[PDB]
């Protein structure tokens, strides 16, 4: 579950922190919020390798472009470079991204699908929990949201995904990008799914395990004298 | 549901605002009317990715054309669309209506189906929703209509297309192309449903 919500003076993106291998939860605290540029962040869904690889590649080329032009990077640049790359690979790079940021042009919120289609909105959601999240956004979104209201709406939309989607879970990560301010990255903004104490300590008595052999491993280089 | 209609003072482009994945509406406020030049616009139907990629290349080609040879004709814009659609027919799912206003040629509409064929028409309809309004549009279209008459013709036409087609819906967007300039119109459900 990834959402983006436009507010008065900026844009806010949120995401859950679960990655899956089939029906198994591989990472209970994944990081789906990526820094393309200091003030351009995007949330990714789909193939985990593809979303990291595609944001890092465009993030690198955006940095070189920014140095070349002596200008702070624009969201439309990151957006254009991402969609032309994804279109080239005809959806085989399974990157579904919500691209947000503030630049000299203002605040922007975009979504980009794996086949290279982009769209513009005040509120977007992508991933398996998009329908759960979009249900909350369609119920509670209004024009002229404050910063505090937009964070609340964004995190509530992620929670909708966490509870009601088996693909989404664990914590809520938020990133607020306000015009004329430093982007604040709120890692684990909410912790609604903290595991309870176990009934028993499964710490074993020492010597429980049967050992065939023991040896020192040499990690040091070839020594002197 | 997309259509372009030539009237006395120029051309009007109309479209719905619905983007679907299966039966889920991915975007309910889509802008399917896109600028390739100041007074050359197109209506996009078929694959969202393909139509966006095609429209982006054509805008590039006409910007470079303008730099060298000045304002391109609507026929020229249609030809560049056709060239991309025909030569890449195997890999593209794109149905595009090209509409533009010259001062010499006035309002012109070109439709480009899947094949990449070109057809110059007084008016054109395309998209899944178009099938339900073939009868209606043929009976109600006249040449050299007024702006108000043409807006009504498109509003009533897409109103029916949206009503019968699950794949069409949301707001009715329109773009008016005349000597006067470029006007954007929007019509909301409460307005066009009661027609």
């Amino acid at each position: 579950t990834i959402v983006g919500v436009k507010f008065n003076n900026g844009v806010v993106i949120a995401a859950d922190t679960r990655s899956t291998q089939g029906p198994i939860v591989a990472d209970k605290n994944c990081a789906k919020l990526h820094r393309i540029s200091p003030k351009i962040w995007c949330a990714g869904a789909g193939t985990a390798a593809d979303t990291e690889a595609v944001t890092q590649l465009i993030g690198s080329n955006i940095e070189l472009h920014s140095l070349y032009t002596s200008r702070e990077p624009r969201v439309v640049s990151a957006l254009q470079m991402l969609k032309q790359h994804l279109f080239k690979y005809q959806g085989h790079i399974g990157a579904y991204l919500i691209v947000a940021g503030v630049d000299p042009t203002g605040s922007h919120l975009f979504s980009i699908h794996a086949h290279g289609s982009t769209d513009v909105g005040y509120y977007l959601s992508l991933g398996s929990g998009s329908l759960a999240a979009m249900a909350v956004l369609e119920s509670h979104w209004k024009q002229d949201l404050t910063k505090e209201e937009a964070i609340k709406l964004a995190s509530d939309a992620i929670q909708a995904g966490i509870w009601n989607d088996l693909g989404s879970g664990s914590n809520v990560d938020v990133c607020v990008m306000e015009i004329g301010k430093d982007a604040e990255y709120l890692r684990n903004y909410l912790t609604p799914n903290v595991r309870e104490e176990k009934q028993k300590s499964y710490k074993f008595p020492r010597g429980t395990t049967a050992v065939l052999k023991e040896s020192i491993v040499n990690i040091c280089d070839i020594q002197e004298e | 549901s997309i259509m372009a209609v030539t009237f006395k003072d120029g051309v009007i482009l109309g479209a719905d605002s619905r983007t679907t994945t299966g039966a889920y509406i991915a975007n309910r406020v889509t802008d399917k009317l896109t600028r390739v030049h100041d007074k050359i616009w197109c209506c996009r139907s078929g694959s969202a990715a393909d139509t966006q990629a095609i429209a982006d290349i054509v805008q590039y080609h006409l910007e470079l054309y303008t730099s060298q040879y000045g304002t391109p004709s609507t026929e020229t814009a249609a030809s560049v669309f056709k060239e991309l659609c025909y030569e890449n027919k195997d890999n593209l799912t794109a149905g595009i209506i090209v509409a533009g206003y010259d001062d010499k040629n006035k309002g012109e509409v070109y439709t480009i189906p899947l094949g990449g064929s070109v057809h110059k028409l007084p008016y054109a309809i395309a998209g899944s929703g178009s099938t339900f309004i073939y009868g209606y549009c043929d009976k109600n279209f006249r040449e050299n209509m007024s702006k108000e008459e043409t807006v009504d013709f498109i509003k009533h036409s897409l109103s029916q297309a949206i009503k019968w087609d699950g794949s069409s819906g949301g707001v009715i967007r329109m773009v008016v192309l005349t000597a006067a300039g470029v006007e954007r119109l929007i019509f909301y459900p409460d307005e066009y449903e009661q027609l």
Partner: peptide
């Protein structure tokens, strides 16, 4: 899925 009037 693939977005598609």
């Amino acid at each position: 899925x693939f977005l598609f009037x």
